[PDB]
Symmetry: C3
Subunit: 261 residues, 3 copies
């Protein structure tokens, strides 16, 4: 049996014929699951939840549970998950709220370790690593390739930029710009994520441009507005780093909570 005889697939659940479901797991009536996804023993998949293909969901995974927001009134809010995600034990990923945009999202190729909590209305990209017991409150955005260290907590509405890194045992209450390492309680910036950018194929010129960008943003007493002018010009320098610097200034121009400093 691809579906264990002790699993409960509630009428209405839509599972591709190739989906495997382990013992004592439950799949709710409003769940849709794509090809080759596996669900481990004791997991509960619920909510108005769409899961993609080739996902490896472990034991005791709570996927699609309702928001922990006291304003939630049982609205059929949504959770959408892409492909090739690894989701480990004692994880929680919640659906959205009608006060925001009604949907929590997770992309592709993510690595979600044990005890990780993804609150209502989060938007997580692709190739993200969420280490053990990393916990995000509502409406957190996490860009592609970001790494969140273990036993870290992230405040509601915070944005974590693409290719950024949050050290373990950190408390993050403002935005991490893309490409930046942050750490501490509360978390502060500590340079460009050089090791990460090297492993991902960024050139020494692109990395060197981002080091300049970091200096401009943090180490010259520039106001955020003054920094944006300088960063915008650096983004047009004609170098390997142009696109990366443009992503940085687009992220800082759009910050709600402001950025860590």
């Amino acid at each position: 049996s691809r579906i264990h005889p002790t699993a409960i697939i509630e009428p209405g659940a839509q599972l591709h014929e190739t989906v495997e479901v382990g013992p004592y797991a439950i799949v709710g009536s409003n769940v849709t699951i794509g090809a080759r996804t596996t669900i481990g023993s004791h997991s509960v998949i619920e909510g108005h939840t769409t899961i993609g293909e080739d996902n490896r969901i472990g034991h005791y995974a709570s996927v699609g549970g309702r928001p922990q927001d006291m304003k939630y009134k049982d609205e059929p809010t949504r959770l959408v998950i892409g492909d090739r995600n690894t989701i480990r034990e004692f994880t929680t990923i919640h659906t959205g709220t009608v006060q925001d945009a009604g949907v929590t999202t997770l992309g592709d190729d993510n690595w979600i370790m044990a005890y990780v909590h993804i609150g209502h209305d989060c938007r997580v990209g692709s190739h993200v690593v969420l280490s053990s017991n990393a916990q995000m409150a509502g409406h957190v955005e996490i860009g592609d390739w970001a790494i969140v260290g273990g036993m870290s907590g992230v405040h509601q509405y915070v944005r974590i930029g693409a290719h950024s890194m949050l050290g373990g045992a950190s408390a993050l209450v403002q935005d991490i710009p893309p490409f930046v390492i942050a750490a501490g309680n509360k978390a502060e910036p500590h340079g460009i994520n050089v090791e990460g950018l090297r492993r991902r194929g960024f050139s020494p010129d692109a990395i060197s441009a981002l080091r300049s960008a970091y200096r401009i943003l943090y180490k010259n007493s520039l106001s955020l507005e003054e920094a944006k002018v300088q960063l915008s010009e650096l983004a047009q320098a004609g170098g390997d780093g142009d696109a990366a610097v443009k992503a940085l200034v687009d992220f800082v121009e759009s910050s709600q909570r402001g950025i860590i400093r």
Copy 2:
């Protein structure tokens, strides 16, 4: 049917006819559950445990497990939970120890989020919010309406005053006085919980008296002895704030671990 056929209700458990119990849940022989309480799938309710009415206990909730105290020798100690509590996933609430009063207590209208841990002999009031992965070691008192932020740890024997707030990712090793906001590792005081109090119906004059009390206690260079005298006088001003200030000074005077500074 209200009790899922795969749920195990041990002979001797006393459930009101309207209690619902989901798949693969277990309810122990010494458990009592009152009207309209729902127990989610995979949950284990055990110990000498009394649960009230209209409680919403989610999946994978461990309610009434034995103390994690090396002195515990399988005594039939108790856990008492009131009415209208919401208890989410991967939660742990333990019975008491015979070295204290043999009981852990939770009142009514509490919001207990995922990964929350309530150790032996805790005394939790009503309208309390315990955010995700807030963990309380043994013998912690939590006053009505208090809020504890996510990923926060509270040392054994700490008291959390009514209407106080502890920020996320904080470590609390001394008492938080009622009406006070605190944050950090270790946690320090950061003023009166002004907006909380206003939303709960505290008058402008009551809040102003509490702001004055906060300065007396923390900002005016007074010894603890001098602050207690001045607080005792402020509590007799004849204003709306009198009862709140009295509660504050009565709390300060009863502290055994001391108050946060």
Copy 3:
């Protein structure tokens, strides 16, 4: 003894006296020795060997695969000894072929709820891991060590025997044996005197260790100077000499360095 709803995969080797509660699962490569009990909903898997007189609670994930992205399904191992208490929502993982292929726990350990023991950890005996203490890969924990609740331990850190880590601490370097540490990040705060007394260390041995602590941390010595002076104390033939030797051998073998 085995609840009818428990799933014991063919191949699992359980002593006749092992008890297994409702809805628990024991994998085909697991061995479990005499008088060990497994609570409801627990999943015991991997190439896992568990000893005698263990008390494993509900929702215990024991023998799960490494969270290392390099893991490719190799038959790596977890070994647990005797008389361990392992509480709820715990995770203990097997090893990786990039280290020595095995995660190990000794005897008489107290493993509280939400504790995480990552791949390739090596945990001794009489260790207390308090609620939600989490250890990344390749963490070594010496005998009698106590790790406080909601603390995180970086990969490859070594916790010395008889040490203590306070709650809500973040440990990124080694704790020498016999030392108290606390904070985010964790810093040293003296010899664990109360611990040593309870465990039978003599007053002379404790005084030697306090002297050793000052040499290492309080006397403005370089590491190289401190090591020579600790070695000279270890050679002086007093009660406590073996303990001081253990300290300097630990400091000399540190890869990540010691907390300061």
